[PDB]
């Protein structure tokens, strides 16, 4: 039964085992909505788009 229900045809494993994927969680819909933080999110995007240190804290 398991084989019949299963797939007949049967890249970062360490991080997946260690960390949580916030993207798939947001896809699921369990994260609460965020309201009125456009400026801070925009600043985070700006820091993330830098060539040299792009680590916003």
């Amino acid at each position: 039964v398991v084989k019949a229900l299963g797939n007949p045809e049967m890249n970062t494993p360490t991080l997946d085992s260690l960390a949580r994927d916030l993207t798939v969680i947001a896809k699921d819909g369990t994260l609460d909505p965020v309201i009125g933080r456009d400026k801070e999110i925009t600043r985070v995007i700006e820091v993330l788009s830098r060539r040299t240190k792009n680590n916003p804290v």
Binding site: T42, I45, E46, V47, S49, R50, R51, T52, K53
Partner: protein
């Protein structure tokens, strides 16, 4: 290399490597290999007894045989106590005999604080290294550095950087940013402004 964080000690090492590649000023350093050692890489995967010792020892023998390697150990203050254990020997005590006899040529890079707290406490390790103070560049020097680096940041952000922007960045970062040092904060200001104007369009 001794200096406050952000002055460019790692940049000094990379400039030495680039000078070696293009044309080294002396002969004795014409064909040399500058290799950056990270203590985390050395300590990693040494779960069995003494594997750190054999690994570092083999590194030292290979340096001695090759004779054309200049080892660059960034964060030299991390050398003390690295790979140590309840009865083991740290990387510093491994490197001391080789430095004393003369088989190793090392380029360290640490700030004044870490150098004074970690390296100066040991006289044997201190008597083999000569501090090279790296001072904060002047305003004109920072402008020259930014002009030299303009091409890479323009390529990354796909914008044009004007000279007036460089002047404003260096002057405003000098006057209004106090916790950091000139080249780093000028570069950060340029990078963030470029990212902002790129994101706006």
């Amino acid at each position: 290399l001794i200096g406050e964080p952000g002055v460019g000690k790692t940049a000094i090492a990379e400039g030495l490597a680039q000078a070696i590649v293009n044309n080294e000023v002396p002969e004795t350093l014409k064909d040399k290999r500058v290799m950056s050692l990270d203590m985390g890489t050395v300590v990693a995967g040494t779960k069995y007894r003494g594997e750190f010792e054999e690994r570092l020892k083999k590194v030292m023998e290979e340096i001695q045989q090759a004779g054309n390697v200049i080892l660059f150990i960034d964060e030299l203050h991390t050398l003390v106590g690295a790979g140590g254990a309840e009865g083991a020997i740290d990387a510093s005590n491994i490197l001391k005999p080789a430095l004393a006899r003369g088989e190793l040529q090392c380029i360290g890079a640490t700030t004044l604080d870490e150098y004074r707290k970690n390296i100066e406490k040991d006289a044997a390790l201190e008597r083999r290294f000569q501090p090279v103070q790296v001072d904060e560049p002047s305003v004109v020097d920072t402008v020259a550095i930014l002009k030299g680096l303009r091409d890479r940041y323009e390529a990354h952000h796909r914008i044009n950087i004007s000279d007036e922007a460089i002047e404003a960045a260096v002057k405003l970062s000098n006057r209004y940013v106090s916790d950091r040092f000139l080249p780093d904060k000028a570069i950060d200001l340029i990078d963030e402004a470029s990212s902002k104007v790129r994101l706006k369009s």
